Amino acid sequence: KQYIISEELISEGKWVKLEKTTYMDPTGKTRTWESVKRTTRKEQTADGVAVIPVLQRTLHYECIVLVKQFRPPMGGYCIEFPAGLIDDGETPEAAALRELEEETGYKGDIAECSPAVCMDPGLSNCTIHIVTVTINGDDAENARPKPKPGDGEFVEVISLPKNDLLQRLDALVAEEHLTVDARVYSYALALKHAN
Amino acid sequence: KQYIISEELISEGKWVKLEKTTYMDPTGKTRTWESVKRTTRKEQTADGVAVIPVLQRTLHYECIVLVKQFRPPMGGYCIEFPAGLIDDGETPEAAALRELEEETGYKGDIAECSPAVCMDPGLSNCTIHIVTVTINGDDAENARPKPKPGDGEFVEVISLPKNDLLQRLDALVAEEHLTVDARVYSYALALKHAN
Numbered sequence: 001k002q003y004i005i006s007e008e009l010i011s012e013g014k015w016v017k018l019e020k021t022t023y024m025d026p027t028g029k030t031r032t033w034e035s036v037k038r039t040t041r042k043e044q045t046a047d048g049v050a051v052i053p054v055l056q057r058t059l060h061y062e063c064i065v066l067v068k069q070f071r072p073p074m075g076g077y078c079i080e081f082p083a084g085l086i087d088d089g090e091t092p093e094a095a096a097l098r099e100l101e102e103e104t105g106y107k108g109d110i111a112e113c114s115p116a117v118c119m120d121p122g123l124s125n126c127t128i129h130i131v132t133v134t135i136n137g138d139d140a141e142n143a144r145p146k147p148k149p150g151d152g153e154f155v156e157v158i159s160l161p162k163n164d165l166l167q168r169l170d171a172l173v174a175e176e177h178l179t180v181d182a183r184v185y186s187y188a189l190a191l192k193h194a195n
Numbered sequence: 196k197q198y199i200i201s202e203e204l205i206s207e208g209k210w211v212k213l214e215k216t217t218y219m220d221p222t223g224k225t226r227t228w229e230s231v232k233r234t235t236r237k238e239q240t241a242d243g244v245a246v247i248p249v250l251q252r253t254l255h256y257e258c259i260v261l262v263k264q265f266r267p268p269m270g271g272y273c274i275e276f277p278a279g280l281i282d283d284g285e286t287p288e289a290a291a292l293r294e295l296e297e298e299t300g301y302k303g304d305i306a307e308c309s310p311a312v313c314m315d316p317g318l319s320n321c322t323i324h325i326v327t328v329t330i331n332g333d334d335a336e337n338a339r340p341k342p343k344p345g346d347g348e349f350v351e352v353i354s355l356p357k358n359d360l361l362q363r364l365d366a367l368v369a370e371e372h373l374t375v376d377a378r379v380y381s382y383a384l385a386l387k388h389a390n
């Protein structure tokens with residue numbers, strides 16, 4: 001019972017744009033909101049993907065493979081799930097595997113896909129697909145993983161124990177003034193709650 | 196090795212601010228990046244809080260209390276963890292318990308706190324504290340919780356079994372068009388991954 005009335009643009013850019021959104025609340029009163037939008041998504045259900053890489057070895061408990069990388073908007077380094085954009089025509093699952101191999105060097109298999117989930121609904125229309133992927137650490141191809149980053153992408157890879165992911169994440173945030181992604185943290189919190 | 200060199204304003208607004216950021220990579224080369232910021236930024240620990248509300252009643256499965264709200268930036272409705280901005284001169288924990296009682300009516304006890312985590316690193320600088328709050332559902336004050344929403348806020352409370360969260364979420368996405376918050380989904384995926 002709430003609908004968007006109009007979207008009056010405010011600014012533009014090479015990657016991001018900002019607009020004013022007019023909408024109707026339940027009662028009928030018109031209200032406004034400042035909405036952020038990207039300029040890269042086209043027909044895809046989500047801007048990009050986020051991979052939950054589960055490293056599996058026969059003599060070890062599963063590791064969650066993450067990536068450390070300086071993020072300009074934060075003016076610092078963030079520990080996130082491998083992530084990327086979905087090219088036109090590319091399936092979320094494909095993009096997830098491609099981006100994982102690019103940012104970590106690991107070839108993996110799909111475990112599951114998810115619906116389009118929002119990154120910050122109270123601010124942007126940004127949605128992504130969280131793809132759970134498995135990686136065989138015992139395989140000879142994953143022996144010495146050589147990352148293959150794109151133009152100007154500099155990524156460090158950090159594998160953390162699924163069993164102790166939350167504690168290990170708290171450790172890295174204090175010593176390097178680092179920042180963990182909210183999704184990575186919510187995932188580690190559930191792992192604690194369940195275990 | 197990488198740091199901010201300059202942040203050029205591009206646009207402003209009562210709540211949102213667009214910006215162009217110029218920084219240096221590891222090789223000593225300069226690059227840019229478009230970013231977003233909340234003009235309502237002071238000097239606290241984080242922009243706001245996200246509350247993971249676990250409703251606990253004896254002999255019952257635990258329920259994860261979520262909220263459904265129309266989100267202008269999304270042009271539709273989203274299922275999210277109760278959340279709100281921290282007030283000036285307020286602790287995360289206090290913000291968490293307040294924002295919970297205002298958006299769902301429930302009154303709980305702090306379980307654990309998280310360090311500020313980034314909402315969307317490659318687009319914004321917004322951080323939140325994810326606070327796990329337990330709600331004793333066998334107490335009178337939580338028998339019939341009274342939600343006190345702020346002006347123009349329209350929240351619908353939705354409680355789902357923690358033990359079946361991921362599937363009960365999909366049951367809603369299938370029932371009607373809805374977008375689940377990425378943090379909520381990440382959490383739900385891990386509850387299943389832990390075993």
Ligand SMILES: Nc1ncnc2c1ncn2[C@@H]1O[C@H](COP(=O)(O)O)[C@@H](O)[C@H]1O
Pocket residue numbers: 015016048083084085099151152153227228229230317318
């Ligand atoms: N807001 C932005 N400003 C400058 N470059 C961007 C922006 N958003 C995405 N990119 C580029 O897109 C790449 C995406 O990498 P990834 O999503 O981790 O596969 C980044 O490494 C940048 O080179």
Ligand SMILES: Nc1ncnc2c1ncn2[C@@H]1O[C@H](COP(=O)(O)O)[C@@H](O)[C@H]1O
Pocket residue numbers: 032033034035122123210211278279280294347348
């Ligand atoms: N980007 C925005 N555009 C218009 N109003 C906003 C925006 N961000 C926050 N607000 C206002 O701030 C309130 C914050 O609620 P909460 O997240 O519960 O603290 C919203 O209900 C809006 O009334």
Ligand SMILES: [Mg+2]
Pocket residue numbers: 067080081082083084103
């Ligand atoms: Mg990435």
Ligand SMILES: [Mg+2]
Pocket residue numbers: 083084085099
């Ligand atoms: Mg990409």
Ligand SMILES: [Mg+2]
Pocket residue numbers: 083084099102103149150153
């Ligand atoms: Mg990449």
Ligand SMILES: [Mg+2]
Pocket residue numbers: 277278279298
């Ligand atoms: Mg809210």
Ligand SMILES: [Mg+2]
Pocket residue numbers: 279280294345
């Ligand atoms: Mg509030």
Ligand SMILES: [Mg+2]
Pocket residue numbers: 278279294297298345348
């Ligand atoms: Mg509120």
